[PDB]
Amino acid sequence: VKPNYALKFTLAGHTKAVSSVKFSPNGEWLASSSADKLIKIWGAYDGKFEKTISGHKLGISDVAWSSDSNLLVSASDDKTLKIWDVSSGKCLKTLKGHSNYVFCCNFNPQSNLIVSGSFDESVRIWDVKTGKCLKTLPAHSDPVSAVHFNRDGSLIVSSSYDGLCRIWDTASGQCLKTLIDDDNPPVSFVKFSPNGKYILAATLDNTLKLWDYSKGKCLKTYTGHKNEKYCIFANFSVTGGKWIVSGSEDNLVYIWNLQTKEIVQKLQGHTDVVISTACHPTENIIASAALENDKTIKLWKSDC
Numbered sequence: 001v002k003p004n005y006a007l008k009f010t011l012a013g014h015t016k017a018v019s020s021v022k023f024s025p026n027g028e029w030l031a032s033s034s035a036d037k038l039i040k041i042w043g044a045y046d047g048k049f050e051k052t053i054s055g056h057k058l059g060i061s062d063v064a065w066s067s068d069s070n071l072l073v074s075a076s077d078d079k080t081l082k083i084w085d086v087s088s089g090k091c092l093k094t095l096k097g098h099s100n101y102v103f104c105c106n107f108n109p110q111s112n113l114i115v116s117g118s119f120d121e122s123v124r125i126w127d128v129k130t131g132k133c134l135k136t137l138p139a140h141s142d143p144v145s146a147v148h149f150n151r152d153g154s155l156i157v158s159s160s161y162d163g164l165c166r167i168w169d170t171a172s173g174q175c176l177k178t179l180i181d182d183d184n185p186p187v188s189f190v191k192f193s194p195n196g197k198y199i200l201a202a203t204l205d206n207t208l209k210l211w212d213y214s215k216g217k218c219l220k221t222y223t224g225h226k227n228e229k230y231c232i233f234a235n236f237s238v239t240g241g242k243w244i245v246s247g248s249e250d251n252l253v254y255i256w257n258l259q260t261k262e263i264v265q266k267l268q269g270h271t272d273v274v275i276s277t278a279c280h281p282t283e284n285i286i287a288s289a290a291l292e293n294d295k296t297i298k299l300w301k302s303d304c
């Protein structure tokens with residue numbers, strides 16, 4: 001009925017705000033990115049620092065794993081993305097083509113493509129093997145805050161400070177849907193649900209919304225947290241009870257019951273905005289990360 005997340009480890013090492021945290025699909029690792037221009041790798045179960053991956057010339061806003069846990073992609077203010085071999089630390093490719101800061105990135109399920117979004121208002125699709133830009137979508141009229149592929153890679157969802165979420169056909173680049181509710185606040189995050197039927201979207205009016213994108217209908221809203229300024233990730237927690245997890249500008253992690261929408265737990269400990277959360281793929285473990293006055297990542301574990 002309610003989880004019991006408790007703090008287990010605090011991970012120190014980044015020298016500026018953390019920007020994103022992600023667990024590897026195989027459960028072994030946590031990757032973090034930061035405004036300090038670095039990616040760090042940590043053990044997912046013990047929080048033990050593994051190594052630093054460097055090469056970007058300016059801060060990093062996002063990092064994402066390939067589905068086989070072998071590669072990372074990062075998005076930077078240096079206007080590039082980089083594809084990294086995690087085991088060796090090597091930069092395999094630098095993806096150049098955005099005309100402004102790159103803010104968000106993800107691999108497709110087959111990890112043969114990368115999608116990126118930028119302050120240049122575009123969504124781009126890149127070939128992983130060659131590192132070349134395949135398609136540029138004139139997607140939005142303001143910076144693109146998130147991009148994510150659906151379960152089979154046939155669709156991309158993007159979100160933007162223009163107030164819209166858009167769904168794109170990967171193969172053709174056509175805009176298939178635009179989603180917006182009754183107000184127009186910036187959309188700061190979007191992702192498809194694990195089963196691919198829904199989209200979870202955050203807006204800078206203190207609201208998370210679950211959409212049936214096929215029907216174009218908002219089915220659930222999650223409120224009670226504070227999110228008026230920063231692009232804060234949100235997650236589906238799948239391993240125990242069915243929860244929604246998000247950071248907050250009041251320095252807490254919020255956890256809601258997906259079905260009932262009630263808050264079930266708040267996690268206290270960070271000393272600045274919780275900008276990013278991630279949920280472990282097999283264990284009831286949450287990672288949270290905070291902005292410049294805190295600079296740490298925390299690992300929390302629950303029995304359900």
Ligand SMILES: O=S(=O)(c1cc(Cl)ccc1Cl)n1cnc2ccccc21
Pocket residue numbers: 193194195196197198236237238239241242243244258
């Ligand atoms: O499949 S889901 O995306 C999902 C969400 C979470 Cl938190 C954990 C696991 C899964 Cl599988 N999903 C979307 N709506 C749902 C309603 C009931 C059960 C699952 C639902």
